[PDB]
Amino acid sequence: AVFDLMTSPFTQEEVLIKEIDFLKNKLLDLQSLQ
Amino acid sequence: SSTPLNWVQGPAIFHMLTSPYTQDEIINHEMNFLKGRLLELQEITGKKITGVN
Amino acid sequence: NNVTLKNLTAFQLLSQRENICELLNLVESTERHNSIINPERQRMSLEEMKKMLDALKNER
Amino acid sequence: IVSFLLLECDSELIIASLDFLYQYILPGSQRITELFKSKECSLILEATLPNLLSYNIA
Amino acid sequence: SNIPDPTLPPTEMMTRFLHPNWYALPTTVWLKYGNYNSWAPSFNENGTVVD
């Protein structure tokens, strides 16, 4: 895995929540594929 | 700064050693990575997930 | 039956080289050009067309 | 599109055709008339819809 | 050291080596719709390298 320091008007918590949402949807899609 | 910004350690991007250009090996390693990262982030945050297999 | 970068580049380069060598008249492709045309097959197909046309003509 | 309806071995194509026809005849009645004006579309729908009712349900 | 003797098998390096120049790129799919279904999409070329 790679981590890239960045900057945004969000905070770490909201970014982690968005990552959780996106990864959950992506895993659901990959599971539904098979 | 009219728009206050923060230092945000960004999200982990999936990086495979050998990129095989087809979807089979990619999807296998990617499902593994997704489950691992979901577990890591659930350990970091005070929350729970649904559908993790 | 499998296609990789090497196969694709080799195929494209082979086609290009064949075309250019044909431009300079450095190649004799009578075998290929007469297996594709196949004048025997031409005569066979022509006689088949004639027979089918006669059949359609006489059914009336 | 109704010919696409006539296939059997592609559920997604059938669902797409049915969704398009639904959205087509949805707003009013003149479009129903325009749809059934064609004899081919009418025949294919009449032969297909009841058999699509019992599609892959054993 | 833990290094083995140079006469113990295996002794070859590139026994399972694959260069990216042979990685089986994506191409067309060539679906098949029955036998009397000719008005049907035959290919599926979404992420293909060549048409």
Nearest CB among E18, E20, E24 relative to B22 is that of E24
Nearest residue of chain D to residue E32 (CA atoms): D9
The count of structural domains within chain C is 1
Q: Is A8 helix (H, G, I), strand (E, B) or coil?
A: strand
**d(CA D9, nearest CA chain E) in Å:** 7
Q: Given an 8 Å threshold on Cβ–Cβ distance, is D3 in contact with E34?
A: no
What E7-14 contacts at long range (C-beta under 8 Å, 24+ apart), as own/partner pairs, is none
Return the closest-CA partner of residue E46 out of E32, E21, E26: E26
Q: Does E26 touch chain B (CB under 8 A)?
A: yes
A27 CB-contact burial (10 Å; exposed 0-12 / middle 13-18 / buried 19+): buried
**d(CA E29, nearest CA chain D) in Å:** 15
Q: Given an 8 Å threshold on Cβ–Cβ distance, is A27 in contact with B31?
A: yes
**d(CA A8, nearest CA chain B) in Å:** 5
Q: Does D3 touch chain E (CB under 8 A)?
A: yes
Nearest residue of chain E to residue B23 (CA atoms): E26
Chains that touch E (3 or more CB pairs under 8 A): B, C, D
Q: How many residue pairs from chains A and B have C-beta atoms closer than 8 A?
A: 81
The answer to whether the CB of A9 falls within 8 A of the CB of B4 is: yes
Nearest CB among B14, B15, B41 relative to A19 is that of B41
Range of the domain at C9: 1-60
Q: Is E26 helix (H, G, I), strand (E, B) or coil?
A: coil
Beta-strand runs (E) in chain D: none
Structure-token match 């910004």, residue found:
B5
Cα–Cα–Cα angle for C22, C34, C19, rounded to 5 degrees: 15
Q: Which residues contact E49 (CB under 8 A, 6 or more apart)?
A: C3, C8, E25, E26, E27
Strands B6-9 and A5-8: antiparallel
Q: Given an 8 Å threshold on Cβ–Cβ distance, is E24 in contact with C8?
A: no
Please report residues of A whose CB lies closer than 8 A to that of B45. Answer: 13, 16-17, 20
Determine the Cα–Cα distance for residues D46 and D41; give it in Å rounded to an integer.
Answer: 8
